[PDB]
Design an enzyme around this catalytic site. Structure first.
Site, PDB file in Angstrom:
ATOM      1  N   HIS A  77       0.857  -1.174   0.000  1.00 48.58           N
ATOM      2  CA  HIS A  77       0.000   0.000   0.000  1.00 48.58           C
ATOM      3  C   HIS A  77       0.894   1.224   0.000  1.00 48.58           C
ATOM      4  CE1 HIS A  77      -4.312  -1.244   1.081  1.00 48.58           C
ATOM      5  NE2 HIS A  77      -3.594  -2.337   0.933  1.00 48.58           N
TER       6      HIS A  77
ATOM      7  N   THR B 246      -4.451  -6.266  -9.998  1.00 47.55           N
ATOM      8  CA  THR B 246      -4.898  -5.229 -10.962  1.00 47.55           C
ATOM      9  C   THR B 246      -5.005  -3.810 -10.370  1.00 47.55           C
ATOM     10  OG1 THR B 246      -7.261  -5.862 -10.678  1.00 47.55           O
ATOM     11  CG2 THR B 246      -6.112  -6.801 -12.603  1.00 47.55           C
ATOM     12  N   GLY B 247      -5.039  -3.708  -9.043  1.00 50.34           N
ATOM     13  CA  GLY B 247      -4.943  -2.419  -8.358  1.00 50.34           C
ATOM     14  C   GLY B 247      -6.156  -1.887  -7.609  1.00 50.34           C
ATOM     15  N   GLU B 248      -5.932  -0.808  -6.885  1.00 49.10           N
ATOM     16  CA  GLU B 248      -6.979  -0.166  -6.112  1.00 49.10           C
ATOM     17  C   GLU B 248      -6.658   1.334  -6.089  1.00 49.10           C
ATOM     18  OE1 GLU B 248      -6.869  -2.925  -2.529  1.00 49.10           O
ATOM     19  OE2 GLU B 248      -5.258  -1.681  -1.823  1.00 49.10           O
TER      20      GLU B 248
ATOM     21  N   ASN C 209      -4.317   3.371  -3.604  1.00 48.18           N
ATOM     22  CA  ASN C 209      -2.857   3.510  -3.712  1.00 48.18           C
ATOM     23  C   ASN C 209      -2.398   4.408  -4.867  1.00 48.18           C
ATOM     24  OD1 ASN C 209      -2.362   1.761  -1.432  1.00 48.18           O
ATOM     25  ND2 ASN C 209      -3.021   0.091  -2.806  1.00 48.18           N
TER      26      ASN C 209
ATOM     27  N   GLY D 188     -10.177 -11.772  -7.719  1.00 47.83           N
ATOM     28  CA  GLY D 188     -11.443 -11.797  -6.994  1.00 47.83           C
ATOM     29  C   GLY D 188     -12.590 -12.256  -7.889  1.00 47.83           C
TER      30      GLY D 188
ATOM     31  N   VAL E 269      -9.614 -12.872 -14.155  1.00 55.82           N
ATOM     32  CA  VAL E 269      -8.220 -12.824 -13.725  1.00 55.82           C
ATOM     33  C   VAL E 269      -7.762 -14.183 -13.152  1.00 55.82           C
ATOM     34  CG1 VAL E 269      -6.462 -11.549 -12.342  1.00 55.82           C
ATOM     35  CG2 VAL E 269      -8.481 -10.319 -13.318  1.00 55.82           C
TER      36      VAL E 269
ATOM     37  N   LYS F 234     -15.560 -15.035   1.570  1.00 55.14           N
ATOM     38  CA  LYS F 234     -16.394 -14.423   0.547  1.00 55.14           C
ATOM     39  C   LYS F 234     -17.450 -15.395   0.021  1.00 55.14           C
ATOM     40  CE  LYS F 234     -13.348 -11.877  -2.171  1.00 55.14           C
ATOM     41  NZ  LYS F 234     -12.082 -12.098  -2.884  1.00 55.14           N
TER      42      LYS F 234
ATOM     43  N   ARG G  63     -16.910 -11.840   7.298  1.00 55.27           N
ATOM     44  CA  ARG G  63     -15.715 -12.008   6.500  1.00 55.27           C
ATOM     45  C   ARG G  63     -14.669 -12.930   7.195  1.00 55.27           C
ATOM     46  NH1 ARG G  63     -12.951  -9.533   2.235  1.00 55.27           N
ATOM     47  NH2 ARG G  63     -11.759 -11.467   1.896  1.00 55.27           N
TER      48      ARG G  63
END
Ligand SMILES: C[C@H](OP(=O)(O)OC[C@@H](O)[C@@H](O)[C@@H](O)Cn1c2nc(=O)[nH]c(=O)c-2cc2ccc(O)cc21)C(=O)N[C@@H](CCC(=O)N[C@@H](CCC(=O)O)C(=O)O)C(=O)O
Ligand SMILES: C[C@H](OP(=O)(O)OC[C@@H](O)[C@@H](O)[C@@H](O)Cn1c2nc(=O)[nH]c(=O)c-2cc2ccc(O)cc21)C(=O)N[C@@H](CCC(=O)N[C@@H](CCC(=O)O)C(=O)O)C(=O)O
Lengths: 332, 332
Positions: free
Chosen positions: B38, B105-107, B110, B175, B179, B196, B281
């Site tokens: 992060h 793949t990202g968020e 960040n 997720g 992918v 999940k 979770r």
């Protein structure tokens, strides 16, 4: 104020060796160790380029006292200054008061291969990008939320969450008067290298630092004045001169060194030079008093942080020779 | 090839603590330790973000056995893929066979604050970036000269000079099935997270990984199938429940987690969740047999590398409990 350090040459050594040599620097009484920051070495044949930040962290974890930093890293093209800021803030937390960021305006050899689009920028823009990046990094080291709208770099509400209370000191490398003045104005530290002639130090670099310091109302006495001393010391005078061969590219012009983007082409140009031309750049000595007299000049010229770059593959031998033969003389 | 590992949460701990926690993992019998990557934490208050790569190198110097990697690093936006390839090649040289690159793949969290210009790209582009960046880094890890002219990334004659023979294993987080199929086709490893719901794993992810491996004529048995297990075990039921509170942001929707770009906005959304909802979770258990049975479902569904994420601030407590109560049952 007088500090004696070791230059760990990423261009010449593989990762594990580069880390162990720095550990050996501390074993041998060095105050500091600095690593070059390359994506590509000067030579294709027998060149290396271990990732500089990994060296810093591995060395920090293995040492207790060494001051550690880059000599130098370009935080403006292949690197994202915000990530560099995080990286150094994190290492500042891990190795308290033992980290500095040495910065430079850049060299095509590291930047064009790593994907920089279009033409290698002219000096004004490279210098301009460096000043801005230093601004942004330091704003982030405050630990506060940052909005930054520069000409090159942006930040919107970014924070560095783990950062030492006084930030991260920045050392600025200069090969000429323009960046030296910037270093005097803005730097915690100033970096240069040896063997380019007395005029360079006495007439251009040091007056520019002093004048930058003056411009920003700063004590120049407060700036760490660091130099990489190119020294080839060996009791065997034939070894002392021959040891400089690997470092032949550093004897090319500044222009070639910062604009040639390919190690193959670099090494071609460099291996046109005979060994006795390459040695022009190096303090070549087999007498220790002779050696320390020549190193002593830089001290006289205003440099206080002496970072020793020995050219041969046998770095452990240089370090033994340094601790027995040179360090006692150099420390006074 | 059942492996038990520890998740080191950069979002929850400062740099020194994060490193000592992973050292304590080795001391407690773990086969691996993985770090989140992060720039910004999920929470503004109480949040951290130590540089992942410094963590890996510091932990590597301090440990002898742990497999070490990112879970996961986005190598497409704020990071240059060329430099990631160099960083990991260097680390692979430093810690032979103990390094992997975990990728995602990202968020926006960040990437947007860190100075990405314009609109957070849609999924197709992020995925297509990942695929291309993984290709480029793998070409660099060959050690050969690379000319690369992608849709997003460029190299003109780049080499990595220091690479281990047998490269850097690349683990791919998914997720969703798209992918996951890519992880099947291209990944040395596959990454997902727990809690999940059974259907995601048994009907979406695992069949997609199998489909991917089949379409690339590869053995699925050979792919390391890693899951972050979200587990809150504590003989004290009050702690088992309450310890999850810090991880409220992880119970937000996928769109929220990957789209909200500001930890202050992230934290506010998370703080509107009731503890009951957060608990969904997590494996919340104060009995080792029940806990291991719940963890064992994921082993039944095809996962083999179990990386444990404990939510509490007292990570040493978890490690002691894991060693005495959980590990003997988990090993079988
Ligand atoms: C050459 C030029 O700019 P400069 O910023 O002083 O010098 C160029 C940089 O110092 C240089 O390109 C690199 O960043 C060099 N830098 C390295 N750069 C790297 O990218 N990696 C390194 O490991 C590295 C080692 C290093 C060590 C010491 C040192 O002094 C420089 C080193 C110059 O002369 N500029 C002007 C005049 C030029 C003009 O056109 N106006 C001036 O300062 O007067
Ligand atoms: C969610 C989305 O894509 P995805 O590639 O699965 O994106 C989720 C990613 O895994 C996610 O963005 C991040 O990279 C999260 N990632 C982390 N990303 C980070 O940047 N840093 C981290 O520390 C991090 C930890 C992490 C750990 C495990 C894990 O599984 C993911 C984690 C999706 O649903 N994709 C498609 C469907 C979408 C569509 O439009 N069709 C699919 O795969 O089927």
């Amino acid at each position: 104020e007088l500090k004696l350090g070791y230059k760990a040459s990423a261009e010449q050594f593989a990762p594990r060796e580069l880390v162990e040599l720095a550990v050996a620097a501390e074993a041998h009484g060095m105050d500091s160790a600095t690593v070059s920051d390359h994506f590509q070495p000067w030579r294709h044949q027998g060149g290396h380029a271990p990732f500089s930040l990994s060296w810093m962290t591995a060395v920090g974890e293995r040492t207790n006292r060494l001051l550690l930093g880059t000599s130098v890293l370009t935080p403006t093209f292949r690197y994202n200054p915000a990530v560099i800021a995080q990286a150094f803030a994190t290492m500042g937390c891990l190795y308290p008061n033992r980290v500095f960021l040495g910065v430079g305006t850049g060299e095509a050899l590291n930047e064009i291969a790593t994907g920089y689009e279009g033409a290698w920028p002219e000096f004004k823009e490279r210098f301009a990008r460096l000043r801005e990046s230093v601004g942004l990094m330091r704003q982030l080291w405050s630990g506060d939320r940052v909005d930054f709208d520069g000409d090159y770099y942006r930040l919107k509400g970014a924070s560095i969450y783990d950062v030492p209370d006084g930030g991260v000191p920045v050392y600025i490398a200069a090969g000429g008067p323009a960046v030296a003045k910037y270093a005097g104005r803005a730097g915690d530290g100033f970096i240069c290298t040896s063997g380019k002639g007395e005029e360079l130090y006495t007439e251009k670099l040091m007056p520019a630092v002093r004048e930058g310091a003056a411009a920003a109302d700063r004590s120049v006495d407060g700036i760490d004045k660091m130099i990489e001393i190119k020294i080839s010391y060996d009791p065997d005078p034939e070894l002392a001169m021959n040891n400089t061969r690997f470092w032949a590219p550093l004897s090319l012009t500044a222009e070639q060194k910062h604009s040639i983007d390919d190690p193959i082409e670099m090494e071609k140009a460099a291996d046109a030079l005979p060994i006795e031309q390459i040695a022009k750049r190096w303090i070549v000595a087999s007498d220790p008093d002779e050696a320390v007299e020549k190193v002593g000049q830089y001290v006289t010229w205003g440099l206080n942080h002496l970072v020793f770059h020995a050219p041969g593959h046998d770095q452990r031998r240089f370090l033994e020779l340094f601790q027995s033969d040179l360090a006692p003389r150099l420390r006074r």
